C-alpha cells in the first residue's frame, strides 16, 4: 500500500518531533503540528519507492541552549538492521562531533548489531525504536503522569533536604518506555507530578537504575 | 476656516462680516438669517424659547444637530453605497460628491466630503487632481482613494514607496551587522512568512492595494534601485512582495507576473531550505520554460534569484550536494543535479550582470571550474576523511594546491563555493581544516569574502569555536591571512571583526587580545560604528 | 492504539502486564490503583 | 482555584474526603453565639480575607523554608486551601453565615 | 550547451587516487574493528 504507509510515515514523524521536544532540544512551533497534506506536499505522498522514501526524511535538531549538541534520527529501509547497516551510520555520525543518534528500525534489530552498538555507548550514545512503539505518544495517555528529568544540582539539594542516600528513593528501571523516551540512563531522577484525590497533588522521585 | 461655502449659496463668516460692517441694525438682519434661510421648521425656532430659557445658549444645540445630521447623513450614504442598485447608487454618490466638492474645504465638513469620496470606488480625475493638490486632503485619503491617485502617478508613487524601502534596507543593514553572533539566530533564522509580515512588506503590499500596475510599478522601482545602487535587498522585498500577494490571494497579480511559479517553488524551497531534487527538477523545467522573444522573463527569474536568501540556500544545496558525492564517491562530472545547481547559482549571481548588460540570456559557465576547481575540494573533504580514518587506525595534510588557489582568486562561482565549503568545515568544528583553507582565504575573486553576507555568516560559525578561539596561532592567522587584508581599508570587515572579538573577546589570548586592541584601534575617518564597538569592549573586558 | 480514528488517550486496557510493558511503571501504578478501588466499590462497600 | 479543581477532579464529582467539617464548625459557631441571622453583622470582610490568609500559613504539614518544603507544602494542603478558602468567601459569610 | 571533455586533467586523477587511498584505509579499519 502506499496511502497506509504515507500516513504511518507521517505519524511516526509527529511523534519524533514531540520526543525532540520534550527532550529540550529546538522544534519549530509550525513542523510540531504539521498536518497530513503539508507532509505530503513536502515529502511526495509516493513513497512506494518513490519520492519520500526513507533517508530523506532523517532529521538533525540541536540543542535548545547549545548549539554545539544535536541528534541525528535515522531511518532504516531494511526491516532487519544489521551491523553494516549501523557501522555506516556511525561513520556518518563520526564526521560531524555530535555523539547521539535514534534509530528507527522497523522489525527487530539483530542482536549482533545490538552488541556493537552497546560496545561503543561511552564514546557515542545512540539507541533504537521499534516503528510500532512511535505510532502513538505514550506521555499523552491518561494514565501516564507529567515526568520531569532534574539536573545534578537540584538532585543533591532534594538528598540535603530529606536527609537520604539516592539508593533509598524508588527506582524506575532503564528499560521502561517513558524512561526510554526521555533517553534518560542510569543515575538520574526523576520528578513526577501527580494529580491526587485527598491533596490535591502529589510530586514523587523515582532514581533510574 | 470658513471657505468654500460661498459656492453654494450659503453664506460664511466672510459675506456675514461684508454685509454687517455696513449695517446698522445686526439684530433684524440676524433674526431673518437665522429665521428665514435657517432651518424652515416651526419646530427649532419654537424650540428657541425654552433652549434659551434653560440658560444653555441655543450654539450649543445648534452643533449638536449640526454634528449629528452629518454623523446620520455620512452613515446613510455608507448603507446606500452597499444597498441597491450599484451603478444608480454610485451615480447618485457621484452627484453628492460633486455639490460636496464645494464644501471640501471646511474642516467640519471636510469629513463628510472625505468619507463620500471614499464611498466612491473611483474618483473622477478632475476631483482627484485637486485635492492631491493639498497636503491634508492627500492624506486623508482612504485606501481606495490612494490607490486612484498612484494608478496614474508614477513620481508620486515612487515617492511614497521610496521611504519603506529606505527602512527596510536600514533593518537589513542592522541586522547583518548584529553584535549578536550566533548560529541559533541569524540574518537567514527568521522564516520567509514573517519577514513578508514584517511591517515593511505587508505596508507595501497595503499602498499597493489590489492594483497590477501599482505592483508592477513598484517591482520596477525595486529593479531600478537595486540596478543602480547595487543593493540586492531591494530583490529579496520584491520577491516577498509577490509571494506575500499571492498568499493573499491577489490571483490578478499571480497572473500577470511570469516568474509566479518559479518564485513560488522557490519560496517553497527557501522554507525548506534544501532544494531537493524533485524542487530542483521543478526549478528547472520552469527554467525551461521561458519562450524565446520574451527573454525578459530570464531577467526577472534571475533577479528573484538574486535574493541574499535565495542565493544562500542555492548556495547551501550546491555544496550539500558535493559532500553528497564525496561521500558517494562520484566525479563531478556524473552529476547532473551538481549542473543544475550551479546553473541556478549562475543565474541568481548573474542577475545584475545581465540586466545591466540588457541581455535577457544564460551567460556561458565555464567547465573549467566544474572539471578542475570542484575536484580539489573534494579532496580536502576525502583528505578529512583520510586523516580522521586513519586517527582510528593504528598528520593531516594542509598542503593547498595552486590550482585551488587560482580558481578561486579567478572565478567567481568557485569563490562563492569554497567560501560556503570553508563555513561548513567550520560548522565542523575542525581547525586543522580552517588553517588548511586559510591560505585560500587569503585572496578570493569578486571580494564576496568582504562582503557583509559572508562576513555575518563567517563570524556566526566562528562564534562556535570560542575554545579555539584560546589559542594565539590560530585567531593570528585567521585575522592577518583574511581580515588584517580589509579591515584597515574596507569598514565593514573591520566591524564585522569587532563585534566577534566581542562576542568572543574572554577567549582571546591577551597577548592576541592586547594584538587585535592595538592593531585594530579605531581610525579617525571610518565610521562612528568601530569606535562605538571598541569602547563597548574596553568597557566591558576591564 | 496505533488503529487510525481510535483515540490513543482514554483507552485503556484492564490487563495489569499489559499496561505495565505498554505505559511504563506510573501507568501501571495507576491502573492497579483503579482496577482495586472498582473491585472493591463494585459491591457500595467504602474503603479509605 | 477553581480551574486547578476542574482538572484535578473531571466527571463533576464534588464529593471529597477532608479533615473538618466547615460547614458544621460554622452551625456550631452560629449555635454558640446566637448569630441572630437577621440584622446586619459587624464583620469587616478584609478581617475574613486575612484571617483565612494567616490561617493558611498556621496549617503545616511539611515544614521549612527553602523552595523545596515550600513547594512540598503547598502541594500537601492545596484542596484544604481550595476547600477553606470556598467556604469562608466575603460573600458567603455576609449573605450566608 | 558546455563542453566538457571526457579526458582526465590532474584534478580528477588525483581526486581518483585519494578515493582509492580512502578506500584501502576504510577496508583496512573494517579488518580492525569488525574483529
Redesign the interface.
Same mark, same amino acid.
Request: a positive charge; zero cysteines; glycine letters at 0%.
Given at each position: 500500500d502506499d496511502e497506509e504507509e504515507t500516513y504511518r510515515l507521517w505519524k511516526i514523524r509527529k511523534t519524533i518531533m514531540q520526543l525532540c521536544h520534550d527532550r529540550g532540544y529546538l522544534v519549530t512551533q509550525d513542523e510540531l503540528d504539521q498536518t497530513l497534506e503539508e507532509f505530503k506536499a513536502q515529502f511526495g505522498d509516493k513513497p512506494s519507492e518513490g519520492r519520500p522514501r526513507r533517508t530523506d526524511l532523517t532529521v538533525l535538531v540541536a540543542h535548545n541552549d547549545d548549539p554545539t549538541d544535536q541528534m541525528f534520527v535515522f531511518f532504516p529501509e531494511e526491516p532487519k538492521v544489521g551491523?553494516k547497516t549501523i557501522?555506516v551510520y556511525c561513520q556518518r555520525m563520526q564526521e560531524e562531533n555530535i555523539t547521539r543518534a535514534l534509530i528507527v528500525v522497523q522489525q527487530g534489530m539483530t542482536p549482533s548489531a545490538k552488541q556493537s552498538l552497546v560496545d561503543m555507548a561511552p564514546k557515542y550514545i545512540l539507541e533504537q525504536f521499534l516503528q510500532q512503539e512511535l505510532l502513538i505518544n505514550i506521555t499523552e495517555h491518561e494514565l501516564v503522569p507529567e515526568h520531569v528529568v532534574m539536573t545534578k544540582e537540584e538532585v543533591t539539594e532534594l538528598l540535603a533536604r530529606y536527609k537520604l542516600r539516592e539508593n533509598q528513593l524508588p527506582r524506575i528501571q532503564a528499560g521502561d518506555p517513558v524512561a526510554r523516551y526521555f533517553g534518560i540512563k542510569r543515575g538520574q531522577v526523576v520528578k513526577i507530578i501527580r494529580p491526587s484525590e485527598t491533596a490535591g497533588r502529589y510530586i514523587t522521585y523515582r532514581l533510574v537504575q | 476656516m470658513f471657505a468654500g461655502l460661498q459656492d453654494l449659496g450659503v453664506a460664511n463668516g466672510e459675506d456675514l462680516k461684508e454685509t454687517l460692517t455696513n449695517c446698522t441694525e445686526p439684530l433684524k438682519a440676524i433674526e431673518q438669517f437665522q429665521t428665514e434661510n435657517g432651518v424652515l421648521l416651526p419646530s427649532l425656532q419654537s424650540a428657541l424659547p425654552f433652549l434659551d430659557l434653560h440658560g444653555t445658549p441655543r450654539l450649543e444645540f445648534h452643533q449638536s444637530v449640526f454634528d449629528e445630521l452629518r454623523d446620520k447623513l455620512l452613515e446613510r450614504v455608507s448603507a446606500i453605497a452597499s444597498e441597491g442598485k450599484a451603478e444608480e447608487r454610485y451615480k447618485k454618490l457621484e452627484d453628492l460628491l460633486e455639490k460636496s466638492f464645494s464644501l471640501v474645504k471646511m474642516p467640519s465638513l471636510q469629513p463628510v466630503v472625505m468619507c463620500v469620496m471614499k464611498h466612491l470606488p473611483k474618483v473622477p480625475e478632475k476631483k482627484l487632481k485637486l485635492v492631491m493638490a493639498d497636503k491634508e486632503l492627500y492624506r486623508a485619503c482612504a485606501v481606495e482613494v490612494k490607490r486612484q491617485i498612484w494608478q496614474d502617478n508614477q513620481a508620486l508613487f515612487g515617492d511614497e514607496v521610496s521611504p519603506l524601502l529606505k527602512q527596510y534596507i536600514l533593518e537589513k543593514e542592522s541586522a547583518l551587522f548584529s553584535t549578536e553572533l550566533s548560529v541559533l539566530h541569524n540574518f537567514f533564522s527568521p522564516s520567509p512568512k514573517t519577514r513578508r509580515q514584517g511591517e515593511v512588506v505587508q505596508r507595501l503590499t497595503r499602498m499597493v492595494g489590489k492594483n497590477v500596475k501599482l505592483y508592477d510599478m513598484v517591482l520596477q522601482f525595486l529593479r531600478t534601485l537595486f540596478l543602480r545602487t547595487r543593493n540586492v535587498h531591494y530583490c529579496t522585498l520584491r520577491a516577498e512582495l509577490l509571494m506575500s500577494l499571492h498568499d493573499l490571494d491577489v490571483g490578478e497579480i499571480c497572473t500577470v507576473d511570469p516568474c509566479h511559479k518559479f518564485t513560488w517553488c522557490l519560496d517553497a524551497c527557501i522554507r525548506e531550505r534544501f532544494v531537493d531534487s524533485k524542487r530542483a527538477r521543478e526549478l528547472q523545467g520552469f527554467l525551461d520554460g521561458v519562450k524565446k522573444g520574451q527573454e525578459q522573463v530570464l531577467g526577472d527569474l534571475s533577479m528573484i534569484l538574486c535574493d541574499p536568501f535565495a542565493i544562500n540556500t542555492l548556495a547551501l544545496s550546491t555544496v550539500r550536494h558535493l559532500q553528497e558525492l564525496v561521500g558517494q +564517491?562520484t566525479?563531478?562530472?556524473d552529476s547532473p543535479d551538481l549542473l543544475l545547481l550551479l546553473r541556478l547559482l549562475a543565474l541568481g549571481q548573474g542577475a545584475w550582470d545581465m540586466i545591466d548588460s540588457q541581455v535577457f540570456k544564460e551567460p556561458?559557465? +565555464?567547465?573549467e571550474l566544474?572539471?578542475?576547481?570542484?575536484?580539489?575540494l573534494? @579532496?580536502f573533504l576525502?583528505?578529512d576523511?583520510?586523516f580522521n580514518?586513519?586517527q582510528?587506525?593504528?598528520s593531516y595534510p594542509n598542503t593547498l594546491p595552486e @590550482?585551488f588557489t587560482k580558481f578561486l582568486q579567478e572565478q567567481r562561482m568557485a569563490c562563492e563555493v569554497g567560501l560556503y565549503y570553508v563555513l561548513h568545515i567550520t560548522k565542523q568544528r575542525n581547525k586543522n581544516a580552517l588553517l588548511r583553507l586559510l591560505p585560500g582565504l587569503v585572496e578570493t575573486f569578486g571580494d564576496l569574502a568582504f562582503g557583509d553576507i559572508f562576513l555575518h555568516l563567517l563570524t556566526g560559525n566562528l562564534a562556535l569555536l570560542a575554545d579555539e578561539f584560546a589559542l594565539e596561532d590560530f585567531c593570528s592567522s585567521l585575522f592577518d591571512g583574511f581580515f588584517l587584508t580589509a579591515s584597515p581599508r574596507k569598514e565593514n570587515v573591520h566591524r564585522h571583526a569587532l563585534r566577534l572579538l566581542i562576542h568572543l573577546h574572554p577567549r582571546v589570548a591577551p597577548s592576541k587580545l592586547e594584538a587585535l586592541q592595538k592593531a585594530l584601534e579605531p581610525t579617525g575617518q571610518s565610521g562612528e560604528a568601530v569606535k562605538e564597538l571598541y569602547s563597548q569592549l574596553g568597557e566591558k573586558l576591564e | 492504539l496505533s488503529e487510525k480514528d481510535v483515540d490513543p488517550v482514554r483507552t485503556t486496557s484492564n490487563d495489569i502486564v499489559e499496561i505495565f510493558t505498554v505505559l511504563g511503571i506510573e501507568a501501571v501504578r495507576k491502573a492497579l490503583e483503579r482496577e482495586l478501588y472498582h473491585v472493591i466499590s463494585f459491591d457500595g462497600s467504602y474503603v479509605n | 482555584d477553581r480551574e486547578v479543581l476542574r482538572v484535578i477532579f473531571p466527571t463533576g464529582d464534588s464529593k471529597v474526603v477532608l479533615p473538618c467539617n466547615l460547614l458544621r464548625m460554622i452551625w456550631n459557631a452560629q449555635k454558640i453565639f446566637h448569630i441572630n441571622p437577621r440584622l446586619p453583622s459587624d464583620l469587616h470582610p478584609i478581617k475574613v480575607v486575612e484571617g483565612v490568609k494567616e490561617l493558611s500559613k498556621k496549617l503545616v504539614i511539611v515544614n521549612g523554608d527553602d523552595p523545596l518544603s515550600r513547594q512540598a507544602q503547598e502541594n500537601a494542603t492545596l484542596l484544604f486551601n481550595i476547600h477553606l478558602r470556598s467556604t469562608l468567601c466575603s460573600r458567603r459569610m455576609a449573605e450566608e453565615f | 550547451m558546455?563542453?566538457?571533455?571526457?579526458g582526465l586533467?590532474?584534478?580528477?586523477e588525483?581526486?581518483?587516487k =585519494?578515493?582509492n =587511498?580512502?578506500?584501502k584505509? =576504510?577496508k583496512? *579499519? *573494517?579488518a580492525?574493528? =569488525?574483529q
Open positions: 551491523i557501522k | +564517491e566525479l563531478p562530472r556561458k559557465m +565555464e567547465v566544474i572539471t578542475r576547481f570542484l575536484p580539489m573534494m @579532496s576525502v583528505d576523511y583520510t580514518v586513519d582510528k587506525l593504528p @590550482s | - | - | 558546455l563542453v566538457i571533455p571526457p586533467s590532474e584534478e580528477e588525483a581526486l581518483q =585519494k578515493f =587511498k580512502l578506500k584505509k =576504510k583496512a *579499519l *573494517l580492525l574493528k =569488525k
